[PDB]
Write an enzyme that holds these catalytic residues in place. Structure first.
Site, PDB file in Angstrom:
ATOM      1  N   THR A 198       0.814  -1.213   0.000  1.00 12.85           N
ATOM      2  CA  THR A 198       0.000   0.000   0.000  1.00 12.85           C
ATOM      3  C   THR A 198       0.855   1.272   0.000  1.00 12.85           C
ATOM      4  O   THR A 198       0.677   2.166  -0.826  1.00 12.85           O
ATOM      5  CB  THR A 198      -0.987  -0.031   1.173  1.00 12.85           C
ATOM      6  OG1 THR A 198      -1.564  -1.330   1.049  1.00 12.85           O
ATOM      7  CG2 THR A 198      -2.037   1.060   1.101  1.00 12.85           C
ATOM      8  N   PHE A 209      -7.056   8.754   1.588  1.00 14.22           N
ATOM      9  CA  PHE A 209      -6.867   8.201   2.927  1.00 14.22           C
ATOM     10  C   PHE A 209      -8.223   7.944   3.567  1.00 14.22           C
ATOM     11  O   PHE A 209      -8.289   7.752   4.769  1.00 14.22           O
ATOM     12  CB  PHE A 209      -5.955   9.072   3.813  1.00 14.22           C
ATOM     13  CG  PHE A 209      -4.503   9.103   3.380  1.00 14.22           C
ATOM     14  CD1 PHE A 209      -3.670   7.999   3.581  1.00 14.22           C
ATOM     15  CD2 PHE A 209      -3.990  10.208   2.713  1.00 14.22           C
ATOM     16  CE1 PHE A 209      -2.340   8.011   3.159  1.00 14.22           C
ATOM     17  CE2 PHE A 209      -2.663  10.217   2.272  1.00 14.22           C
ATOM     18  CZ  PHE A 209      -1.832   9.134   2.513  1.00 14.22           C
ATOM     19  N   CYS A 218      -7.441   6.982   7.364  1.00 16.40           N
ATOM     20  CA  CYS A 218      -6.196   6.270   7.591  1.00 16.40           C
ATOM     21  C   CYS A 218      -5.471   6.858   8.816  1.00 16.40           C
ATOM     22  O   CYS A 218      -5.048   8.009   8.770  1.00 16.40           O
ATOM     23  CB  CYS A 218      -5.310   6.353   6.344  1.00 16.40           C
ATOM     24  SG  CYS A 218      -3.716   5.507   6.562  1.00 16.40           S
TER      25      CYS A 218
END
Ligand SMILES: CC(C)C1=CC2=CC[C@@H]3[C@](C)(CCC[C@@]3(C)C(=O)N[C@@H](Cc3c[nH]c4ccccc34)C(=O)O)[C@H]2CC1
Length: 456
Positions: free
Chosen positions: A268, A393, A400
């Site tokens: 990621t 995000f 995130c």
């Protein structure tokens, strides 16, 4: 008016299910969005979802009073080894809010000062690897970026060295993790998973889970046994108390948090660096501008925390790579009550939405006509960007937790790469995006020519 939602082509009783029988589902969904527009219904036997692509609709999906995070089937399969860590838990599970309150201060911008030196340790290994290449050897970009990102989260996260720059074969934990992730992804397009044909998969899955659990629990146990205090997340989790409940995380949950962070810190994050370097070599004037910034700012043998903060244009480079190829390309929501989306589409409580981030990031109403161009300058004045237009995000309290960590690491590493090396796209690489848990430029290779600047 109440408008009837578009739907892509159907396959009789299988409905839309076969459209995701493909090794590039996200890219397939992007093409469907280009044809059908800002929203489409996707049906399969026993389920319906709706895929959103416009800022107009995603800004409403991002209203946490109306929509909460849904566990997609993808997240549900990962939960078999990520358990009730932050990534794979429902907002209403007690362990979600507890871990969120305990971990947030470990992941703040301020807390990056503490991880900075361990990040430098891994970035220096990357630079040294490349300095040590013989002439006309090349670099396998995603492969090296993954070595960096995985090692950085291991070291900063629990003071563990995966030593990825010392290996061709991944560490045993990584082997099991990647194979568990692959298995979890494969399950998505697997009819008759209970077929005895898939006996061997199940056994392999359980072995991989055991590997992961054994090593993490053992790291946990050893740390408590030793009583040592460190600059790492594991210390903060063993010590931390949730202000709300007053409780600590138990050892099982800490394990799930660790496994979770390792998943994230793998492809990621390395994906961001890989796409960033891809765009830079394909846009030499942008590369030059970023290289000039790195040379101007990184005046010391080793970058300081403050210096990384000064790499503004490098930060914009990363943001423009996140715009075009967000490495965590979709997330799922459910309607908390009956509601009407965009004044036109009625939803019932429980109805699910998927946000297709790469398509959001191509909304011409936000970005203008040049949406396919790599232009970091788009990010010069971030206040001009409308709400919820840029979402690499995710959203809200379920966004995130790693965003500051990921961007500090990426900025530091790309900064140093641009200071130390000139880059050559020596094969004229043709972008090919491989889709697993994440997105990456498969087979992306470059040559680096040292500028011969010391690290000492
Ligand atoms: C674990 C995290 C990092 C990930 C999140 C994801 C979310 C959406 C996913 C994903 C991009 C993988 C490709 C399928 C896709 C787009 C999806 O819509 N999937 C829906 C729809 C779907 C596809 N196959 C299914 C089978 C059963 C039920 C639903 C589905 C889903 O997962 O729910 C996937 C990548 C991995």
């Amino acid at each position: 008016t109440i408008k009837e939602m578009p739907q892509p082509k159907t396959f009789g009783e299988l409905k839309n299910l076969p459209l995701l029988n493909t090794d590039k589902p996200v890219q397939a969904l992007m093409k469907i969005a280009d044809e059908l527009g800002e929203i489409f219904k996707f049906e399969a036997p026993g389920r319906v979802t709706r895929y959103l692509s416009s800022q107009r609709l995603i800004k409403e999906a991002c209203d946490e009073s109306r929509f909460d995070k849904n566990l997609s089937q993808a997240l549900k399969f990962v939960r078999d080894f990520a358990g009730d860590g932050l990534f794979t838990s429902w907002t209403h599970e007690k362990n979600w809010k507890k871990a969120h309150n305990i971990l947030l201060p470990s992941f703040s911008q301020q807390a990056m000062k503490g991880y900075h030196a361990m990040m430098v340790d891994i970035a220096v290994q990357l630079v040294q690897k490349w300095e040590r290449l013989n002439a006309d050897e090349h670099i396998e970009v995603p492969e090296d970026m993954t070595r960096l990102t995985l090692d950085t989260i291991g070291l900063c996260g629990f003071n563990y060295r995966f030593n990825s720059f010392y290996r061709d074969q991944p560490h045993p934990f990584i082997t099991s993790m990647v194979r568990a992730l692959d298995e979890a992804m494969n399950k998505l397009q697997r009819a008759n998973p209970d077929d005895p044909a898939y006996d061997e998969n199940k056994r392999q899955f359980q072995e991989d889970i055991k590997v992961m659990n054994d090593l993490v629990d053992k790291i946990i146990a050893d740390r408590k046994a030793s009583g040592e205090q460190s600059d790492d997340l594991l210390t903060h989790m063993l010590n931390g108390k949730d202000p709300e409940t007053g409780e600590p995380l138990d050892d099982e949950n800490i394990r799930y948090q660790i496994i979770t962070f390792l998943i994230a810190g793998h492809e990621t994050t390395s994906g961001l660096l890989s796409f960033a370097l891809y765009f830079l070599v394909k846009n030499p004037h942008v590369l030059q501008k970023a290289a000039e910034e790195a040379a101007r700012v990184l005046v010391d043998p080793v970058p300081s925390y403050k210096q990384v903060k000064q790499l503004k244009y490098v930060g914009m480079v990363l943001n423009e790579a996140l715009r075009l190829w967000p490495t965590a390309p979709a997330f799922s929501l459910y309607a908390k009550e009956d509601t009407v989306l965009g004044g036109e589409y009625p939803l019932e409580k429980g109805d699910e939405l998927m946000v297709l981030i790469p398509q959001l990031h191509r909304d011409k109403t936000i970005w203008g006509d040049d949406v396919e161009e790599f232009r970091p300058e788009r990010f010069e004045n971030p206040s001009a960007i409308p709400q919820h237009a840029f979402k690499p995000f995710g959203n809200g309290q379920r966004a995130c937790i790693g965003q500051q960590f990921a961007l500090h690491e990426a900025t530091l590493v790309l900064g140093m790469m641009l200071k130390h090396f000139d880059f050559e796209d020596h094969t004229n690489y043709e972008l090919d995006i491989k889709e697993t848990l994440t997105l990456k430029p498969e087979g992306f290779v470059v040559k680096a020519k040292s500028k011969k600047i010391p690290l000492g």
